[PDB]
Amino acid sequence: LQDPAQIVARLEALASPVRLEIFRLLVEQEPTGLVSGDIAEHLGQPHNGISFHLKNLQHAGLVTVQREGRYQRYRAAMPVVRALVAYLTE
Amino acid sequence: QDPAQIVARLEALASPVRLEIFRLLVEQEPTGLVSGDIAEHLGQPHNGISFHLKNLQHAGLVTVQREGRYQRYRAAMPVVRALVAYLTENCCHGTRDCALS
Ligand SMILES: [As]
Ligand code: NA
Ligand code: NA
Ligand code: NA
């Protein structure tokens, strides 16, 4: 049962060049993901703005933080991705 | 694919009523529906449903054919498949080595 309000918010989180780039970079970087500083470099964007965009994707569920002790890597949430693909094509 | 066409596609789908119309059309492949039937099923006035179909049509996510009184719409499933292949492209450093099925 997928909340259409959640699907909307995920598509809205994606419908921005910069958020789409972050997301697609994190898909390509599965399953280890990236520190937010490396995302910002791949984007040519200030690290602070990237942290905001990331929080927008994270609130929508499309990106999760993989934490090992204190060390945080952002990852695409592939389960939620696969569910989105199914919602739109199945 | 142009990135601007991709964002436009996501924008068209990020709309509750447009998403409901498009999922209905996906469900009704391959025959599609005339717009009046789409509005009647959703219990909405035709003027708003037609508008939202147009938006999906500009985005390329629906195809349209004349049939008198209304227009028959279909989901353009090759375009939607293309959108999801773009979102997943190069998964796992181009290997595609993770659960995508
Ligand atoms: As993968
Ligand atoms: Na991109
Ligand atoms: Na990742
Ligand atoms: Na259809």
Side-chain angles (χ1 to χ4, degrees), chain A residues 4 7-8 11-12 14-17 20 23-24 27-31 78 81-82 84-90, chain B residues 6-7 10-11 13-16 19 22-23 26 77 80 84 86-94 98-100:
Chain A
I7 298 304
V8 163
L11 297 158
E12 204 158 346
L14 301 167
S16 143
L20 182 57
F23 173 78
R24 295 225 302 161
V27 174
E28 177 267 321
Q29 293 290 313
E30 278 284 275
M78 297 307 293
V81 177
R82 289 190 316 266
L84 177 71
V85 167
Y87 194 84
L88 298 173
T89 67
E90 287 190 15
Chain B
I6 297 303
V7 177
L10 290 162
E11 286 169 325
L13 295 158
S15 157
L19 187 56
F22 178 84
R23 277 277 280 184
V26 169
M77 296 309 293
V80 205
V84 311
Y86 195 94
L87 292 171
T88 60
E89 180 179 278
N90 283 327
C91 188
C92 310
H93 311 294
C98 69
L100 295 154

Side-chain angles (χ1 to χ4, degrees), chain B residues 17-51:
Chain B
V17 66
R18 280 185 300 272
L19 187 56
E20 183 163 31
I21 293 165
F22 178 84
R23 277 277 280 184
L24 177 55
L25 289 184
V26 169
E27 194 270 309
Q28 290 304 308
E29 278 291 279
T31 44
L33 298 176
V34 299
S35 68
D37 284 358
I38 293 176
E40 200 56 55
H41 185 78
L42 296 177
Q44 293 304 325
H46 184 260
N47 67 341
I49 299 305
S50 171
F51 174 96

Side-chain angles (χ1 to χ4, degrees), chain B residues 34-36 46 64-65 67-73:
Chain B
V34 299
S35 68
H46 184 260
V64 63
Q65 291 184 286
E67 161 171 335
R69 150 65 76 154
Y70 323 98
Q71 297 271 74
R72 176 179 295 283
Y73 291 82

